[PDB]
Amino acid sequence: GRVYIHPI
Amino acid sequence: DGIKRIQDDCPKAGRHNYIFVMIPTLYSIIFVVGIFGNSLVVIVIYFYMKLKTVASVFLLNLALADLCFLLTLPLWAVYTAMEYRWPFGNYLCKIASASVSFNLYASVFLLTCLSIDRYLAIVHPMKSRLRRTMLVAKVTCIIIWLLAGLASLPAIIHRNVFFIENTNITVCAFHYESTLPIGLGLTKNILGFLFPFLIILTSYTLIWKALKKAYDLEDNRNDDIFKIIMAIVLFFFFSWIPHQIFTFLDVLIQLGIIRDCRIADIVDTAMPITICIAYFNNCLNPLFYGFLGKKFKRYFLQLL
Amino acid sequence: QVQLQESGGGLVQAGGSLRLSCAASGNIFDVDIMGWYRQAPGKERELVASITDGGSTDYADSVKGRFTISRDNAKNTVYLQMNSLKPEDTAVYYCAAVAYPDIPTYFDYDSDNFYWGQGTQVTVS
Amino acid sequence: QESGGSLRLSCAASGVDIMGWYELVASITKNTVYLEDTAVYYCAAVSDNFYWGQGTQV
Ligand SMILES: *[C@@H]1O[C@H](CO)[C@@H](O)[C@H](O)[C@H]1NC(C)=O
Ligand SMILES: [Cl-]
Ligand SMILES: [Cl-]
Ligand SMILES: [Cl-]
Known part of the structure; x- marks a missing residue:
């Protein structure tokens, strides 16, 4: 899927 | 406990050489500045000033909330530097993401309570003097820490370390399959910005109009403070509206209309920039609000 | 910082009369809003009566009709005729007063721009 | 410098902000308070910048 690697 | 294997829809988004250098450097700068700044703020407000007001209590807890975020900053710094590789395991992934989210909600809630305190302190000083005590301040602060944790609970739950099969990269992130993750974004949008911005604007607008109506009778200091107030609102607004905007733009890619990897690349390219802006201007919040007091500025200057 | 000198307390008969005088001392500029707070024994503190510089007043419902507060903007003295x-x-x-600095930023982490006094004991016999 | 132990208690500081008498009795916010x-x-006056006294018996 979509991988949100950002801290927030 | 376990490591899940994930496939990435738009993997090479925001994977650029200049970001891998630019973002850890800015993180290092915010870390160094924020630690010694807010540490000296805590030194001045408690041990040097003794916390004799309600705003003093809110200021203390504001600096203490920012310090907790700053301590996890280095994890994100070396995480970004390794081209988004997470070597710290699942535990620190959980607490670091929850700490960023916790600093968000905590600092915004504390500003809200500071605005209400300011309004009640200038517009209705004598009647709100008795009801605005130290116990209500400390109780409000524990309620805010509890609620901020409560708001960042889905970060602890849904943040894992995943193995991206198609790139062989170990990351610390949220995995979006539909699946209603947009709650995590709306809660940032409406619960983390819309409601507190409305309340803050409201309080400072009531102070604005009260003091203007006061000076009208004389004209038919306090002329400076307006520009100051206009800073306070806009400074709160313009330092969070970048992140918020791209956060909303992220929701459209999470499960909806945007189905492109180039747009995903622009969003993942810009998100760390907005994060940097937001948290640099946030870690300056206790120092900016403190220098609005003559005695605090005198003590903090003398400490240098 | 800002000192409030009070006078006029003591022991008085029931239905008598008294006069509390509170003079603010120190500040170069004027004081915004002055008032009185009574601390009842074994109870919480209660607002008695307040007066602004412009001429606005605010008495407590329990003392409405019996007390009267006034002030002098010349030397910043408040008189509670009881x-x-x-x-x-x-x-x-x-005694309580709200004093601000010269070019005032309405943030104050020291006294919240609210100044108190030592207080006079008033006992009615 | 305390003295006075109806009565009256006089505290004279030597060498400022929130002077008070102590359970806090009464505190006002040559710097000498009279109760x-x-x-x-x-007698107290707001380490921790809170200077106390020897105390007078009443
Ligand atoms: C990942 O590593 C495995 C070996 O462990 C290899 O077979 C595979 O081709 C690699 N995938 C990529 C995208 O490099
Ligand atoms: Cl009311
Ligand atoms: Cl690996
Ligand atoms: Cl201050």
Whole structure:
């Protein structure tokens, strides 16, 4: 899927 | 406990050489500045000033909330530097993401309570003097820490370390399959910005109009403070509206209309920039609000 | 910082009369809003009566008709003329004032721009 | 410098902000304050920048 690697 | 294997829809988004250098450097700068700044703020407000007001209590807890975020900053710094590789395991992934989210909600809630305190302190000083005590301040602060944790609970739950099969990269992130993750974004949008911005604007607008109506009778200091107030609102607004905007733009890619990897690349390219802006201007919040007091500025200057 | 000198307390008959005088001392500029707070023994503190510089007043419902507060903008002194002192008025009356600096930023982490006094004991017999 | 132990208690500081008498009795916010009542009254003035006194017996 979509991988949100950002801290927030 | 376990490591899940994930496939990435738009993997090479925001994977650029200049970001891998630019973002850890800015993180290092915010870390160094924020630690010694807010540490000296805590030194001045408690041990040097003794916390004799309600705003003093809110200021203390504001600096203490920012310090907790700053301590996890280095994890994100070396995480970004390794081209988004997470070597710290699942535990620190959980607490670091929850700490960023916790600093968000905590600092915004504390500003809200500071605005209400300011309004009640200038517009209705004598009647709100008795009801605005130290116990209500400390109780409000524990309620805010509890609620901020409560708001960042889905970060602890849904943040894992995943193995991206198609790139062989170990990351610390949220995995979006539909699946209603947009709650995590709306809660940032409406619960983390819309409601507190409305309340803050409201309080400072009531102070604005009260003091203007006061000076009208004389004209038919306090002329400076307006520009100051206009800073306070806009400074709160313009330092969070970048992140918020791209956060909303992220929701459209999470499960909806945007189905492109180039747009995903622009969003993942810009998100760390907005994060940097937001948290640099946030870690300056206790120092900016403190220098609005003559005695605090005198003590903090003398400490240098 | 800003000192509030109070006078006019003591022991008085029921239905007598008293006059509390509170003079602010120190500040170069004027004081915004001055008032009185009585601390009843074994109870919480209660607002008695307040007066602004412009001329606005605000009395407590329990003392409405019996007391009268006034002020002098010349030397910043507030007078609480207390008539018909009933036993409900026995307390420690404290003075309160709201003073701001020259080019004031309405943030103050020291006194919140609220200054108190030592308080005079008022006992009605 | 305490003295006075109806009565009156006078505390004169030597060498400022929130002087008070102590359970806090009464505190006002040459710097000298004048104030089941049998206790040792202490004078205070707001380390921690809170200077106390020897105390007068009443
Ligand atoms: C990942 O590593 C495995 C070996 O462990 C290899 O077979 C595979 O081709 C690699 N995938 C990529 C995209 O490099
Ligand atoms: Cl009210
Ligand atoms: Cl690996
Ligand atoms: Cl201050």
